[PDB]
Amino acid sequence: RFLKVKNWETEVVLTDTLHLKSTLETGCTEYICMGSIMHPATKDQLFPLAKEFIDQYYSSIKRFGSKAHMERLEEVNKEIDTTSTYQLKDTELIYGAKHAWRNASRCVGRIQWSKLQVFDARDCTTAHGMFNYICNHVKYATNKGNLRSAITIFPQRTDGKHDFRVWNSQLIRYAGYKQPDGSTLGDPANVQFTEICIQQGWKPPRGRFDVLPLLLQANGNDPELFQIPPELVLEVPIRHPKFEWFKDLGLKWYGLPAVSNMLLEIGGLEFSACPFSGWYMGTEIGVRDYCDNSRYNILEEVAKKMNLDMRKTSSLWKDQALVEINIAVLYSFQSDKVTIVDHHSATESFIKHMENEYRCRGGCPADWVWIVPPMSGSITPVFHQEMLNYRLTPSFEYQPDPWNTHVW
Amino acid sequence: CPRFLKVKNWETEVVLTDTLHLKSTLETGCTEYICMGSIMHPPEDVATKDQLFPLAKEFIDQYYSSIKRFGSKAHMERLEEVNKEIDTTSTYQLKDTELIYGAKHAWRNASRCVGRIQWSKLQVFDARDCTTAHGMFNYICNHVKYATNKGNLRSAITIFPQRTDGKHDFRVWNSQLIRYAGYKQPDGSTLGDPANVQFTEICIQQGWKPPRGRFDVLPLLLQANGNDPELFQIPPELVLEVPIRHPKFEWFKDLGLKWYGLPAVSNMLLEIGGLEFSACPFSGWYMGTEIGVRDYCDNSRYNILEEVAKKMNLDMRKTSSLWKDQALVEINIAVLYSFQSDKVTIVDHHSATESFIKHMENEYRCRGGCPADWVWIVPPMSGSITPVFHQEMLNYRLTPSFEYQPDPWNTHVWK
Ligand code: HEM
Ligand code: HEM
Ligand SMILES: CNCCc1cc(C#N)cc(OCc2ccc3c(C)cc(N)nc3c2)c1
Ligand SMILES: CNCCc1cc(C#N)cc(OCc2ccc3c(C)cc(N)nc3c2)c1
Ligand SMILES: C[C@H](O)[C@H](O)[C@H]1CNc2nc(N)[nH]c(=O)c2N1
Ligand SMILES: C[C@H](O)[C@H](O)[C@H]1CNc2nc(N)[nH]c(=O)c2N1
Ligand SMILES: [Zn+2]
């Protein structure tokens, strides 16, 4: 069936055909919707999946059923038959990575999807190799503040006992320390990871914003610690354009958001190590990272310096402080010429991106729960935009944390 | 389908277990290959006898289970009595006790409502003896006066006769009992509430003489027994309003904004045991954001962000200054302050979302679940600093329920 989606602000109606191509389940059924749930090979499995991907690749370059296409099918078939897997061509790898981003239903930044620098690291064999590759990624992506989207792809999974993994959840994150008095210093999101680094030999500064070491696992071996050279770690001290006292809060963040714990799937092949990076939407830092109760939780401190009456919730003192923090963050990044996008501009771009995809591609899978910003929702255009969510491959998937799997 | 489904709160780590979804009745619109969770809405004929029996039995069973008389003599007798009614008259009538139970539970089952901790405290007004629009007007006026209660608002529903053949429907044509007019101007601009321009035009055609102001309370347009609808003015003394002022910004009053105290939705259909109540206005009290974010700041509504921001002397040329966000917060601060000052019941979005979490938890424990639509439950501003943002929810449709129905002017056969 052709499915329609309406924008209730502009009354624009798009028609979705693309969803007809998905073959992977979403978690919902006819009788129960799980749209707010965060997470609901063999030779015989592998070839149909490879064939599907090869087919859409040669279809994408307008040479479906070509001599080259047919040969590739045969090439891939023989290679699965004789090795229980196959290797992607470089062109395929790049096409696959861009489309995993394209298909990422939860990403509001996908207007950029085809500007992705793809680093092929499939010849890597050791944690030291991974560290070199990651350093180059970071240096290239940071670009002195003029951030550039990139992904580095390490060797595919083989038998499951020789996985490459980046144990860090992002390449750059701050440590979190569980205090004697039961509280938390630094980032409470990373307390467990920090403890593993400590246990593995990392000597913690025990400050509020200590950059974590890289913890890297190659070919299924024990992971090894590495310090990212500090000149590669671009950071922004947070200040406020009106409140002189804001800089006295001591807040800072890092410029490069680079998620490193997801799994890239292309044509049935699994890439368990594929750190990918872009640039920040301000709310990621200013709302979630700084103001989640289970994160840096700074609302009370800021509201106090703002001298706001904090006794009753209906004074909306949290909401006032939230906006000012997010102002400061955008101002700080912009003053230091570090790429950042505000949630108005970002969501705006995403609506334009949806219109592009519906025209040229017949749809765009999108997850309203994640696309709508964590503040000021309904004064952004995506709030009023009906979206259809469905799962297309290639894709980025969640995977279990390595310390639950690995035996040393 | 699995017997136990789990939901997690990502802030508190609390994990709840849902068994109530097993009692789900109609489809959600999703399939296993697509999710329609952000779609707003995923023939003139009525239920046949065969369609009607199992729906009635289902409801009667559920009623007697609730009062701990399942399998009792009374239960079996009521079953038999209902069965005979349907067989000889192709429909049946609810007992008052059943009617009150069904109405309370349609609210309890309303996945999009954040206010459901209050569900058992609902004043049900039985208007199934109503025969004319004048009578509907009498019932609606009494409802408004009772629910308003001089500002100490009390939740209530008034239930007009159920549907019979579908050519004799009772309808309130208004979408809410109390709403403001909108008037499209020859030059393309709108006066009043742009959301209501269509309904307003209908009223004007029906004879209404419009004041043509910014906040003119609309007349009731009331359809009894399938007849042409009739106009009635609500006695202005029955319409509680709050002028919007600001605890710090003295100039805020000069904006001349006000809103009405009583949110009373009147265009939904109540379904109980396969019976359809097409006219069933229900009312509660407001969450601030319903007025301060949506009513006032939606672009296709009153759209006041700009004018407020200018009076705040904000720099408005760069979106990254968050002038919209800054203005939005102050507007919502004003609304809560004005209502509280005038002692009209209102709830802020922090308090409401916290109550709903406690409510949900209690429902999971005492009922085996609580259907919730995250896309509607999370407030239109400051989402993640409310506890519902981090709460996984399962959405599914239980009966009795409130349902959408077609706009009456689109279907009505004019006499
Ligand atoms: C270029 C600028 C980008 C911006 C502004 C952006 C923005 C965002 C935001 C705000 C989220 C929600 C994050 C959260 O709340 O945790 C997100 C999710 C996501 N992004 Fe993007 N993103 C960008 C680039 C990219 C790139 C380059 C990739 C991959 C090559 C990517 C893949 C993803 C994926 C897979 C998710 C969802 C992960 C999940 O399911 O948990 N994004 N993005
Ligand atoms: C008592 C105080 C109440 C509060 C604070 C409250 C709050 C809300 C809010 C904020 C919404 C979202 C509205 C929107 O964005 O359009 C909503 C929706 C809804 N409420 Fe409640 N509500 C209350 C009482 C009631 C009552 C008494 C009923 C019925 C007996 C009810 C039934 C519903 C239904 C059916 C919806 C969703 C309508 C739809 O699907 O479009 N509510 N409520
Ligand atoms: C409490 N937060 C946990 C939610 C989360 C989990 C995982 C994983 N695995 C991955 C996630 O990725 C979000 C993401 C991914 C990529 C991003 C890029 C490339 C840029 C950007 N600005 N934000 C991103 C944000 C998020
Ligand atoms: C502008 N978009 C309108 C979306 C909407 C449509 C319908 C219908 N039909 C009914 C709706 O009801 C929302 C609602 C219903 C009852 C409420 C009560 C009883 C109290 C309250 N504070 N808000 C309500 C809000 C909303
Ligand atoms: C497209 C989207 O489903 C639509 O804008 C919804 C989103 N969530 C909402 N949530 C509430 N409470 N009220 C609404 O009117 C809407 N509108
Ligand atoms: C329970 C709920 O699904 C969860 O809190 C989600 C809601 N929406 C989100 N949206 C974004 N962008 N990021 C998130 O981490 C979340 N968390
Ligand atoms: Zn769904």
Side-chain angles (χ1 to χ4, degrees):
Chain A
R1 350 284 187 272
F2 298 67
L3 298 168
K4 319 271 177 182
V5 287
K6 180 176 182 178
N7 181 296
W8 293 89
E9 180 191 349
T10 72
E11 312 225 54
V12 168
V13 176
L14 311 173
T15 298
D16 198 287
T17 51
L18 177 57
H19 73 274
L20 296 174
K21 284 72 182 175
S22 59
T23 39
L24 313 174
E25 296 180 341
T26 59
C28 305
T29 74
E30 281 82 342
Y31 285 92
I32 305 117
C33 168
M34 302 193 195
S36 55
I37 306 287
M38 193 160 298
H39 339 277
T42 77
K43 303 183 186 177
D44 301 285
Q45 302 182 308
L46 194 65
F47 182 77
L49 295 189
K51 186 209 188 313
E52 174 188 6
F53 172 77
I54 300 306
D55 280 344
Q56 82 172 64
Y57 171 78
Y58 279 95
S59 158
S60 77
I61 61 164
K62 282 252 193 300
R63 277 161 186 243
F64 182 93
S66 69
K67 187 190 190 295
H69 181 191
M70 281 181 292
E71 290 178 40
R72 186 59 179 139
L73 286 183
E74 172 79 314
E75 191 178 21
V76 172
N77 190 45
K78 156 102 168 63
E79 187 179 346
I80 299 173
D81 220 344
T82 58
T83 50
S84 325
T85 177
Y86 71 114
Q87 305 295 321
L88 300 177
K89 304 295 184 209
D90 292 356
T91 49
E92 291 163 5
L93 188 65
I94 297 155
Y95 170 88
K98 293 178 171 192
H99 274 72
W101 185 8
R102 199 187 187 172
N103 297 335
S105 73
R106 295 178 161 172
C107 178
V108 73
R110 281 181 283 168
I111 195 172
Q112 290 283 342
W113 74 270
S114 70
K115 276 195 52 185
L116 182 69
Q117 186 59 41
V118 175
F119 292 118
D120 183 5
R122 288 175 292 164
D123 64 1
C124 195
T125 71
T126 73
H128 279 88
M130 295 177 71
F131 171 76
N132 187 236
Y133 267 111
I134 281 163
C135 277
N136 293 341
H137 178 133
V138 166
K139 183 173 203 178
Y140 170 91
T142 295
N143 189 36
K144 297 180 190 296
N146 187 8
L147 306 177
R148 294 182 295 206
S149 294
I151 184 174
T152 294
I153 300 167
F154 294 109
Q156 60 206 43
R157 170 175 282 139
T158 49
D159 52 8
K161 347 183 194 66
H162 302 100
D163 283 6
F164 286 72
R165 291 298 293 271
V166 180
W167 281 35
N168 314 61
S169 56
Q170 298 178 23
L171 301 181
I172 299 175
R173 295 213 91 180
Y174 296 120
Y177 307 96
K178 207 47 186 50
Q179 291 285 74
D181 61 274
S183 50
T184 296
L185 170 71
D187 191 343
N190 304 311
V191 168
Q192 202 181 35
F193 181 84
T194 297
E195 289 174 350
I196 298 149
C197 296
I198 297 174
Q199 177 245 329
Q200 280 310 120
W202 185 65
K203 315 304 186 183
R206 289 215 156 76
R208 212 186 167 183
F209 304 100
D210 308 340
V211 170
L212 284 163
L214 286 167
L215 181 61
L216 305 178
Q217 162 188 347
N219 195 49
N221 296 305
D222 298 350
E224 313 173 24
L225 286 171
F226 304 92
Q227 174 211 32
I228 308 164
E231 65 270 21
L232 298 192
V233 178
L234 175 55
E235 289 184 312
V236 183
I238 310 314
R239 51 226 176 259
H240 192 275
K242 177 178 66 194
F243 294 144
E244 297 284 1
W245 50 257
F246 198 98
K247 60 181 194 304
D248 302 328
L249 290 183
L251 298 169
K252 63 164 72 175
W253 208 251
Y254 50 91
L256 182 78
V259 164
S260 52
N261 55 6
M262 294 196 87
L263 183 146
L264 168 61
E265 181 214 293
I266 302 171
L269 303 183
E270 297 183 316
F271 296 100
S272 48
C274 58
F276 49 85
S277 70
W279 57 79
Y280 268 119
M281 185 168 78
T283 53
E284 289 182 88
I285 309 164
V287 187
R288 306 297 316 281
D289 290 344
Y290 280 173
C291 295
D292 279 8
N293 292 335
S294 61
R295 293 302 294 278
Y296 273 83
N297 193 21
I298 74 177
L299 280 176
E300 329 162 20
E301 177 139 340
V302 176
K304 275 220 50 153
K305 290 305 192 70
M306 297 185 59
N307 286 327
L308 300 182
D309 198 336
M310 294 169 55
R311 264 179 277 96
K312 291 193 180 279
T313 54
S314 70
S315 76
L316 303 202
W317 67 264
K318 285 194 176 178
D319 311 65
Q320 282 183 295
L322 184 70
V323 171
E324 299 300 330
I325 288 157
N326 278 276
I327 288 174
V329 161
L330 291 162
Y331 177 74
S332 296
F333 272 61
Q334 284 171 1
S335 292
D336 288 358
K337 310 202 160 40
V338 177
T339 310
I340 192 165
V341 63
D342 67 67
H343 53 285
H344 301 293
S345 169
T347 52
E348 235 188 74
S349 74
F350 186 78
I351 291 299
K352 169 68 184 191
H353 171 69
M354 275 184 74
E355 300 183 88
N356 289 339
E357 295 293 82
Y358 271 84
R359 187 209 321 123
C360 74
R361 199 188 185 192
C364 174
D367 186 338
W368 195 100
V369 177
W370 277 61
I371 295 290
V372 177
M375 75 182 294
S376 307
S378 73
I379 64 172
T380 70
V382 294
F383 182 91
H384 306 271
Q385 180 66 56
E386 294 180 344
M387 305 171 187
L388 292 168
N389 190 16
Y390 45 92
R391 178 176 286 296
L392 302 178
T393 189
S395 56
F396 296 104
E397 303 291 339
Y398 296 96
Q399 56 185 335
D401 294 314
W403 47 87
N404 296 327
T405 294
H406 189 65
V407 47
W408 293 65
Chain B
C1 278
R3 163 150 274 279
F4 306 101
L5 293 172
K6 287 166 208 303
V7 301
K8 178 169 188 181
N9 185 303
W10 286 93
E11 177 163 75
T12 61
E13 316 266 37
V14 175
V15 174
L16 307 164
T17 306
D18 184 293
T19 62
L20 184 58
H21 69 272
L22 291 173
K23 285 287 174 59
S24 168
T25 60
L26 205 131
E27 311 109 338
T28 60
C30 301
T31 82
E32 51 188 354
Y33 300 106
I34 197 176
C35 170
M36 305 224 180
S38 67
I39 304 292
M40 267 218 209
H41 311 85
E44 283 268 349
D45 42 79
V46 281
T48 69
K49 286 173 175 180
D50 303 328
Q51 275 167 11
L52 193 45
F53 294 116
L55 287 171
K57 173 171 183 301
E58 186 181 339
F59 171 78
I60 296 294
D61 282 352
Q62 182 198 134
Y63 174 69
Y64 274 86
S65 197
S66 81
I67 60 162
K68 300 306 192 303
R69 296 291 187 278
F70 189 93
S72 74
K73 181 184 201 275
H75 182 199
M76 298 300 117
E77 282 177 356
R78 180 61 182 142
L79 238 20
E80 180 70 25
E81 177 186 49
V82 162
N83 199 327
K84 292 181 172 198
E85 275 202 65
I86 293 173
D87 216 49
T88 66
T89 77
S90 57
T91 187
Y92 71 106
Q93 302 295 316
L94 296 168
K95 296 293 172 56
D96 305 336
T97 57
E98 298 167 346
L99 189 76
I100 294 146
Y101 171 85
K104 289 185 175 174
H105 279 250
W107 184 9
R108 189 188 193 181
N109 291 345
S111 58
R112 290 171 170 180
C113 180
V114 71
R116 285 181 279 166
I117 190 161
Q118 287 286 348
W119 73 268
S120 65
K121 191 167 179 184
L122 178 76
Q123 187 54 36
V124 171
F125 296 121
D126 185 4
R128 289 174 288 164
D129 67 359
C130 198
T131 73
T132 69
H134 281 92
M136 295 175 74
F137 173 71
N138 191 42
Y139 272 111
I140 283 163
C141 283
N142 295 339
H143 177 142
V144 168
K145 195 180 185 172
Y146 173 90
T148 295
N149 192 27
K150 297 171 183 304
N152 187 16
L153 322 189
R154 297 178 289 195
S155 76
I157 177 152
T158 294
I159 305 170
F160 291 107
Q162 68 214 45
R163 166 174 302 153
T164 51
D165 58 11
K167 303 162 184 187
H168 293 87
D169 293 350
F170 282 67
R171 293 296 292 273
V172 184
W173 281 37
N174 308 64
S175 57
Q176 299 181 24
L177 301 178
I178 298 173
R179 276 201 115 173
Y180 295 129
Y183 314 89
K184 261 307 229 298
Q185 303 309 103
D187 76 348
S189 78
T190 303
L191 184 44
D193 185 346
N196 296 312
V197 173
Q198 187 178 2
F199 175 74
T200 298
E201 287 175 353
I202 291 162
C203 287
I204 289 181
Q205 184 180 357
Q206 291 305 129
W208 190 52
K209 308 215 180 331
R212 304 199 124 258
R214 197 178 180 198
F215 300 111
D216 308 335
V217 177
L218 283 160
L220 296 165
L221 187 56
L222 303 184
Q223 163 176 24
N225 201 40
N227 292 313
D228 292 343
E230 307 172 12
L231 292 171
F232 304 95
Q233 180 204 32
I234 295 163
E237 66 264 16
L238 286 187
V239 177
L240 187 48
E241 296 180 299
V242 183
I244 313 304
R245 51 238 196 243
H246 190 284
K248 289 173 137 67
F249 296 133
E250 309 264 357
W251 47 258
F252 206 98
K253 65 163 176 299
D254 305 331
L255 299 168
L257 304 178
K258 66 178 178 166
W259 207 253
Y260 50 90
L262 185 82
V265 156
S266 60
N267 61 359
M268 295 194 72
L269 182 152
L270 162 66
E271 181 264 321
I272 298 163
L275 302 175
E276 303 185 295
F277 300 93
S278 48
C280 63
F282 50 85
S283 65
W285 52 80
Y286 268 119
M287 187 164 68
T289 65
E290 285 182 280
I291 306 173
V293 187
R294 307 302 313 287
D295 293 339
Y296 278 174
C297 294
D298 273 17
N299 292 119
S300 71
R301 297 297 301 278
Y302 274 88
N303 189 16
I304 67 173
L305 281 177
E306 182 170 12
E307 189 187 4
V308 173
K310 299 189 177 188
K311 305 227 67 155
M312 292 186 65
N313 272 126
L314 300 181
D315 184 286
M316 296 172 50
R317 7 188 197 180
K318 281 162 161 51
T319 67
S320 59
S321 75
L322 306 196
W323 64 266
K324 277 192 185 179
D325 314 68
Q326 230 165 2
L328 177 66
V329 171
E330 306 289 356
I331 287 164
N332 277 274
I333 287 180
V335 160
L336 289 159
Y337 174 74
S338 306
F339 270 68
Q340 285 168 344
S341 291
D342 282 6
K343 300 209 167 58
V344 175
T345 309
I346 192 159
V347 64
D348 67 77
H349 53 279
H350 298 289
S351 175
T353 53
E354 182 184 8
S355 293
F356 183 75
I357 293 293
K358 285 168 192 170
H359 170 63
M360 184 169 43
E361 279 167 353
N362 184 67
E363 292 285 87
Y364 265 88
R365 304 184 207 289
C366 88
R367 199 183 181 199
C370 178
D373 186 332
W374 195 100
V375 173
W376 275 59
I377 296 296
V378 177
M381 63 174 308
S382 308
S384 76
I385 58 172
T386 72
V388 291
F389 186 95
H390 305 270
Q391 176 72 54
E392 290 185 340
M393 306 174 184
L394 296 177
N395 191 13
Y396 50 90
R397 288 165 59 163
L398 303 167
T399 182
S401 63
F402 295 110
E403 300 285 352
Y404 286 99
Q405 59 184 337
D407 294 329
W409 51 87
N410 287 328
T411 57
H412 181 58
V413 185
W414 289 92
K415 292 174 167 40

